Amino acid sequence: LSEQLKHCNGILKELLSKKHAAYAFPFYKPVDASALGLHDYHDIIKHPMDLSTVKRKMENRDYRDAQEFAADVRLMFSNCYKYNPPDHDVVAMARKLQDVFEFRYAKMP
Ligand SMILES: CCNC(=O)C[C@@H]1N=C(c2ccc(Cl)cc2)c2cc(OC)ccc2-n2c(C)nnc21
Ligand code: NI
């Protein structure tokens, strides 16, 4: 269990690393809907999620198991797929980062 959470933390650090920054950056911080002019964001997305929040939860030992961690990372991608039309660049970025996540998550100890 501790082992599985270390795997999860490893994945998190990878998603935040420079290697993936070209497509990970939209997911680093909470969506600032006002700043981006997205005045419908919080009406469509009722459970915002982002990598800084996942990191805080990991650092605070909020996550009790790998499934809980994965549900939050996946929620983050789902919010992007819900809000944005599927041909938008940010959706392509989400799909690429989700590929990174899913392939490594699958190597669960
Ligand atoms: C075309 C305008 N679209 C938007 O503003 C939606 C927004 N779109 C982007 C976004 C990201 C990358 C590109 Cl190339 C174009 C738009 C976005 C950019 C951010 O920069 C700090 C943070 C969150 C974002 N994000 C996420 C996450 N989900 N939808 C969006
Ligand atoms: Ni899940």
Side-chain angles (χ1 to χ4, degrees):
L1 177 51
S2 279
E3 194 163 348
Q4 293 174 332
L5 286 168
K6 301 294 203 207
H7 182 64
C8 290
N9 196 48
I11 294 163
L12 174 60
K13 293 298 187 164
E14 178 171 1
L15 299 185
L16 293 166
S17 73
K18 292 283 215 304
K19 174 162 46 160
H20 302 296
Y23 40 91
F25 77 86
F27 309 101
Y28 284 169
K29 293 288 157 57
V31 172
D32 187 338
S34 292
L36 296 174
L38 307 177
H39 300 301
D40 55 353
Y41 191 79
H42 295 287
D43 303 284
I44 293 164
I45 302 305
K46 297 300 184 23
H47 302 287
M49 188 51 58
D50 71 283
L51 296 169
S52 75
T53 300
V54 175
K55 184 177 169 61
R56 178 181 60 78
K57 291 176 69 168
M58 187 64 74
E59 289 170 343
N60 288 170
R61 298 192 271 183
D62 209 347
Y63 294 122
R64 293 199 67 235
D65 51 60
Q67 285 91 336
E68 194 184 352
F69 166 86
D72 271 357
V73 173
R74 287 162 172 158
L75 171 59
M76 179 184 79
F77 296 129
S78 296
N79 287 343
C80 190
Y81 306 146
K82 183 177 188 187
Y83 183 70
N84 294 286
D87 64 322
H88 283 209
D89 280 352
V90 72
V91 174
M93 292 185 176
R95 290 172 75 194
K96 289 168 68 172
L97 198 65
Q98 184 160 17
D99 199 82
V100 175
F101 171 73
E102 295 293 349
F103 278 78
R104 188 168 169 191
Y105 184 73
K107 307 178 180 310
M108 184 64 60

